[PDB]
């Protein structure tokens, strides 16, 4: 019987650093600069004249530490006490929350969208997603069959091939399989099953 040939899809090749993909490069670039800015401003506010070294434990090391810990949502050891640093602390925290939640949501969304995929199968769904091109040998009996038949799915497929452009028809089976291979998908070809399962 008449049957359909497609390009074998291979298997995916996930990148080793795929985990950054749900969040564009400029975000990661700006995060480090904002981290530096906030840490340095909290140091500079933290060590004005006490007028005594005990006046503020926030030396520059501890400032960097507190900023990192605040961003990682894992707590810290010394919170800021001056209103000056209090406010920036709060703000930074807010920013952190926004980023975290956003990232998580985006990942979830991408996964769901990548698993609704439902690849083309059963050869009847081809009627709908006509962005995958398909055609037949020219002048052949398959063409006469599509012209002569009178069933709505085949009526639609015929009307498409009769109206779509550029030409989907080809001169030879070798030309057909060459066109399939060179299209690397997105084009499908019609021929008899006993020919199809030999090319395989």
């Amino acid at each position: 019987g008449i049957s359909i040939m497609i390009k074998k899809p291979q298997k995916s090749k996930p990148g080793v650093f795929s985990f950054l993909d749900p969040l564009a490069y400029e975000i990661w670039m700006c995060i480090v600069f904002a981290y530096i800015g906030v840490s340095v401003v909290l140091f500079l506010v933290s060590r004005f004249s006490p007028y005594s070294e005990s006046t503020n434990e926030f030396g520059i090391f501890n400032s960097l530490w507190f900023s990192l810990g605040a961003f990682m949502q894992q707590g810290c050891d010394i919170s800021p006490r001056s209103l000056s640093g209090r406010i920036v602390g709060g703000v930074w925290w807010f920013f952190t929350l926004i980023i975290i939640s956003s990232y998580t949501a985006n990942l979830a969304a991408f996964l769901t969208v990548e698993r609704m995929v439902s690849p083309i199968e059963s050869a009847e769904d081809l009627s709908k997603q006509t962005e995958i091109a398909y055609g037949t040998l020219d002048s052949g009996s398959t063409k006469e069959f599509f012209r002569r038949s009178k069933i709505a799915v085949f009526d639609k497929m015929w009307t498409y091939m009769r109206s779509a452009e550029p030409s989907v028809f080809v001169r030879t089976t070798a030309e057909g399989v060459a066109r399939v291979r060179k299209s690397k998908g997105k084009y499908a070809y019609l021929l008899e099953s006993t020919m199809n399962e030999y090319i395989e």
């Binding site: 975000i27 401003v41 004005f48 985006n106």
Partner: protein, 52 residues
């Protein structure tokens, strides 16, 4: 319809999304830098307004 040249009823691109981008989040950086500005503005007072 049957000599039309566009997807008349279904055109769902259903794309692998363009990832989240800086255009969507820039407001948070906008408020952040202003928070640092206010922090410095108050820091120029908190320890030293009693100077004389």
């Amino acid at each position: 319809y049957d000599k039309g040249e566009c997807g008349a009823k279904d055109s769902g691109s259903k794309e692998k999304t363009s990832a989240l981008s800086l255009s969507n989040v820039a407001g948070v950086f906008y408020i952040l830098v202003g928070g640092l500005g206010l922090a410095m503005l108050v820091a120029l007072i908190e320890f030293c307004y009693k100077s004389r």
